[PDB]
């Protein structure tokens, strides 16, 4: 008497949320490595696009992922190809490589890594992460709460550190956007909005980790006017 | 296999004494774990119609085995479709029930965040500030 | 517990039922004849299209009485 | 543990390095302590692994540790899987009093 | 018919302007109207913002719709249908896709009763349903509930519904939606008991897959796809990212079993073996025939 | 501490809001709760010291009883319990799937119910059984030897009838010799009541096979 | 005794880790917050709400509405836009 | 709408009077009171229908109509001014009484005549609480029979309070 | 223990008891019902008979009980043993009680199928009731036979007409 269904997606969802720059695989010549090409995800979908031709080609459309994915950045790490670092829900971090196997190219996982719980929720450190523009260390942070950072390294397999933390518990993170640096230290910028206050405030805020003693320091704290927006970073004025 | 031994969860969560309330809440745990979204979810509303008055219940391993049963149960009812039952003595005068129901509404809260969302009893003159977009339709 | 049975009796309910306010479970919270008063006070349009087309304001029963007059 | 209040976990953020179990725990959740369907490896934070510690078991920690320890299946449908490093801490009063009870 | 902010009116035309047909008054719960739709003339759902559908008839001679059945859960309504007399889809502002029935026992006395006996005049209900309302007046002060039917999680917001009864000359009405990001998905209704089986025992295999893999690479490195998410590529389980907001009941996702046909032969081979069923070939002509035939 | 008449006049439902309900923490926001839509009450058996269950209800209770599905396959004969086994695996297999797919409970409960002390459901469903056989225009042999009432003979209140007319509650009761033909009365019948697919029609009905 | 004294230790982690969790007496303020915060932050992580809320409210940018909402957790957020 | 059941074999089910009496009405519900203590029912019912109209008709045509086990069964349906006086004459007859009451207000019941210490006394009801003011302001500390007499509020301390005169204008109103 | 009594559990439905009180549940402990109590083995059962709350529950059921609850003439001839049985018994219990008649309508019955007439019931202690019926509404109900003396023994049928010679052992009704 029950009504029994069928669920099927004709096309997928075309609101392209993310997207990552890096050269992926080597398809169709033999030695060619070009930082054209690129990788889109909203959610769910996932779709991977040529360039370096003037016009945008579609390479694959990967397999149904069915998880809501809340940041895709690609990074580049010295001695290759390039895979996404990709963070979703399940609050796992995912170091996902697509690769080309038997006869059409699949995405391959190297590490995925146990983050808070399955679910968007706003303890949940995902939903901002950017990687040191050398490729040393990935960050992520979240709304409110904790912010991580997992240092990377490469060998004859991958290798991701145990976590590095700050937790603030009532500043609530908007706009993590990294700076760039030249091997010294990763720095990185957030405008925190405190969570309890009887005023607004937003004031932006420095870190920067500390190779030598492994940790993230909170280094300038600046108080702007209630009506910030954002944060990008200057590369090196010298 | 279910459907079969509700009755018989029926005459154990009724007993009198507190060992056959205790176990067999057990066998509604591992039941409901991985019975849930199979879609039968009228058996388990019985079944926890039969265990929400065991909250009160005292005693450290008749309670957690209960509670660990609500817990199961969430996930066979929904988020939403358990919280029906505990919104209302959630804060209730008596410093005793509102103790126990602040338990199983912290299992529920760290079970689900996000989950719960939709279903809070909050309306634009229930709470101060309520959002004013979830009233917004286009 | 006897005054809260004292609450459905026939004694009460006449005190309710003649003083003018209708006896049921919902006016069970309370003695005092003064809020109980409050309580049952807090208790307790069509247009019909004249053949002129103005009549678009014309309630029901107006254009039943000029039915009656028509 | 589930059996033996007086015990306390650690819970802080689970590092890369995963938890291992004594030959007498071997295959058990860490959680709930059932020996059937295993899932996932444990991760153990950095102040749970260090020295000597670290190659203990992360239940009884008193016997040294060779197998991985999974979580079950039903722990990880309950999330319990990810609240934090599921290392107990202190020994308890069981283990305690039955050291002093022989001798 | 047209819905106010609480309450519904129905205008007919006139000249000079259109004029109130009827007007009918909401029960308390519900604050707005955001979908509605019939069924022939003869009934109406009711969606809400924050509460979920109430069922109605039009009452002549009366000149009022009703209601008979409410809902036991809040749901945040953004579209609305009839799949049929008894049943109903629905969209969330969420991302759930639902669909109810309302109960045989209310059934049996809206075939066997006229409208005009529910308003006011006496139909015997059983001492339950009443006991009910005297126990619970917030609950079922509508008589009866809805039971729920199917219930799923697509994380898209649905804007509209399209109920067919045939897809390219197909046997299986099916209904197809489209969501706000854009999108468009087909429910088809599986019409045996056998291919809800095979269906339900291919979704069974490809759920956890990438669980599969894993304990089988460890049983393997004991005695002689590293990643726990191998599969899975993430961090999800189907059920659990299918359930979200409630469990899903009846709905098994046909995209989750379309993935099969995308594996290495080595790993259908392998996944197909947890079967005493037929092989790896069946599986594909099975997954492949909702498409070829079914639409 | 506002009085509860003063609290009942904010709820859509004032009669939930209880004597106690004016000594909570927060009023006005508990008043709003209980009575939103689809909350269910705390179950009433707190201010009780009775530890929820004293056996003044539960003496009498009955110990159990197998399903009649499960009862069919004869193991109530086989193991002798109140006060080698030879069972076929196919029939066992036949009982849970083929036979006993659609099978469920009697009573179940709906969504709002919950289980208080005193109750017993043996005799609700012993109450739907009761509504569901038990029909106006019908008597069985029992309570006819109890009325000393044969077969074919018209019941005692048939004159009062004819008097005063038919049944209220019943427009469409046909009464032999009255409104309906006095020879169709025979055996226990002296009166008679006389006045899709769902789009899922499965169509096909297939159990899971053991073979 | 020692149950319970665990009991009390899990509350004070649990509640550091998922922020609110009600422990016994919690006032109307203290909870409503935390509802607040968990709508907010649903209404601006999936993009479909946030679809949703950018074209109903005609806001001229995605970026501004979930800025909005983010803000919005803020108590003074309220008073800051009264004083434009 | 729930009438009364009498003369009841013991036993009898409530299976049975259910059968019995939906082939008169349809009968909501059958509270059949039992002893707890014997297990043993009382002998008596209460049938609630669920309009007025099926238990005043139930009650017509049921009435000793049916014999179970013999027995007939039975079917059956189911705050004012007052004055203290003493120093009353023994010559003052109750109807007297009430001769004299009467134009002061409308008597609801009959007045009651006591002796106290002798000391010949009487309870005298009225409907309105103005007409005992009328009854009380003339008939005060006033001789008839050739006795003075005494007209008060019978204590219940007496009756005359501020709610006493609000409910009991309502009662009347 | 328990003096080899078998204790029947509370649902099999009733060898008389010896305290018609303490049972087994559905469950296997054991119950007063009473005092609606569980004990856990005999002797706390033995301790509460021997306790004083039982006997307060006892007492208390004893006043709930006790506050609720010129013509034509027949001539009978009835014989009794000789004897024969009645050579075990004589402890002046009742010994001197002679039969007893009494007139019962019919409408009372163990079976309570016909009824419409009456019967002259006639009892003694040891031996089984009689009855006689009479569908005659009156027969020799005379009007003041002796010169009215005040003896009610029983009631004015036994003393009017009935003689007991107690020597022979045979009771005359008429
Ligand atoms: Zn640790
Ligand atoms: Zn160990
Ligand atoms: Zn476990
Ligand atoms: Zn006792």
Redesign the interface.
Known sequence: DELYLYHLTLKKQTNFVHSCIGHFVDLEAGSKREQSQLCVATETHLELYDTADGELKLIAKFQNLFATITSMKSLDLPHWPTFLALTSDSGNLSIVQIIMHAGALRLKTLVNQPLTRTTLRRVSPISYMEIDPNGRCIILSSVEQNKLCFLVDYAQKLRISSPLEIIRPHMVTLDMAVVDVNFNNPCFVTLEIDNAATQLSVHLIFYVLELGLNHIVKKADYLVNPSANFVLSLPDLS | YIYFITPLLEDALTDRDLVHRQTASNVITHLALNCSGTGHEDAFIHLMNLLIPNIFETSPHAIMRILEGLEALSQALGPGLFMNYIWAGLFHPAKNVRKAFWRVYNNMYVMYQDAMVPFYPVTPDNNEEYIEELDLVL | RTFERHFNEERHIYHLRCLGIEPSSVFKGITKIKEAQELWKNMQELELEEEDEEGNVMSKKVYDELKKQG | SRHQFDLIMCLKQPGVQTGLLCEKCDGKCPICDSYVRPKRKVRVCENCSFGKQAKNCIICNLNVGVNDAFYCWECCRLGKDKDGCPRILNLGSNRLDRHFEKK | LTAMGSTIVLYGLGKKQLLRRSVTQTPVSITKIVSMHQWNYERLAVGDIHESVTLFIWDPAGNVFIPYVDDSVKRHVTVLKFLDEATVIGADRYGNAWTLRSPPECEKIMSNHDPSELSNGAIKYPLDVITLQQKLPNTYDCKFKFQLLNHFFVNDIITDFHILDSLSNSDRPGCIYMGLQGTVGCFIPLLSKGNVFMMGNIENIMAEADDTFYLDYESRKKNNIICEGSCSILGRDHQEYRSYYAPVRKVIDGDLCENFLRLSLNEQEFLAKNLKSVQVEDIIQTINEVRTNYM | KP????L??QV??????????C????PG??A????????????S???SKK??????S???????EL?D??KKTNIEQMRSTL?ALDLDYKKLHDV?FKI?AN???DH?????????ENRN?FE?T???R??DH????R??Q??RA???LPEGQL???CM??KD?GL????PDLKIAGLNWDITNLKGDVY?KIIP?????????????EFE | MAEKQRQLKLQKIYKQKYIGLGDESTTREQWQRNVRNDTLNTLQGHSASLEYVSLSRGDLSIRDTRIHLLKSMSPGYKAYLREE | NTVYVGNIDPRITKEQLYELFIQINPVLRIKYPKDKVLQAYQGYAFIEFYNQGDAQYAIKIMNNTVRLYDRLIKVRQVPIAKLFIKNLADSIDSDQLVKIFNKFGKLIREPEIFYLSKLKCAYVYFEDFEKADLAIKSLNNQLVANNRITVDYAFKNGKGNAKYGDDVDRLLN | LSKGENVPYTFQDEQVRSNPYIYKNHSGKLVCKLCNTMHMSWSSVERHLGGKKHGLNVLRRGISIEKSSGSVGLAIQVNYSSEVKENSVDSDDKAKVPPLIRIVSGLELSDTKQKGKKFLVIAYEPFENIAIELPPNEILFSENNDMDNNNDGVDELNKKCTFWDAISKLYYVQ
């Open positions: 009085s509860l008449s003063q009942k006049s859509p439902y004032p009669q939930i809001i209880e004597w106690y309900d000594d909570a923490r927060y926001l508990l709003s709760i209980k009575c939103t839509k689809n909350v269910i009450p705390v179950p058996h707190w201010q530890e929820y269950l004293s056996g003044r539960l003496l009498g209770k009955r110990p159990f399903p599905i499960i006060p849970f006993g099978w469920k409970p179940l409960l709906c969504f709002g119910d919950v289980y208080y459901l609700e012993n109450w739907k009761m509504v038990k029909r106006p225009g008597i069985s029992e309570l109890i009325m000393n019941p005692p209140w009062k009838m005063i049944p209220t509650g019943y009166g899709r697919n769902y789009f899922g029609a499965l169509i096909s009905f297939e159990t899971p």
